[PDB]
């Protein structure tokens, strides 16, 4: 009665969603990852800072 199919199918849903998203934005994520910290510094907030 293990009926693991539920669990493995859910794992597939997650994994295929993940692959789809990676294809969707993989380039965008790669471009963001080197200079992510800049998100913390808005030019005007830089001066108030």
């Amino acid at each position: 009665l293990i009926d693991r199919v539920e669990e493995v199918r859910e794992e597939m849903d997650e994994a295929q969603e993940a692959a789809r998203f990676l294809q969707q934005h993989g380039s965008a994520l790669t471009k963001l990852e080197p200079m992510v910290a800049v998100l913390q510094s808005d030019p005007q907030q830089h001066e108030q800072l």
Binding site: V5, V8, M12, L22, L32, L39
Partner: protein, 50 residues
């Protein structure tokens, strides 16, 4: 900033687990075939009981 941090946190996990789709695919296919065998031999078993 924070959303990007979380995105780059989860993105690794996504990559780690994406490769397993096909490893998962054959896994569930075989598993579900096994469950079908269970159901089928169960029907045969019940017919014996009859």
């Amino acid at each position: 900033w924070q959303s990007a941090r979380e995105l780059l946190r989860d993105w690794p996990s996504q990559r780690h687990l994406a490769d397993r789709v096909q490893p998962l695919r054959m896994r569930l296919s075989e598993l579900e075939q096994r469950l079908n065998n269970q159901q089928n031999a169960e029907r045969l078993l019940s017919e014996f009981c009859k």
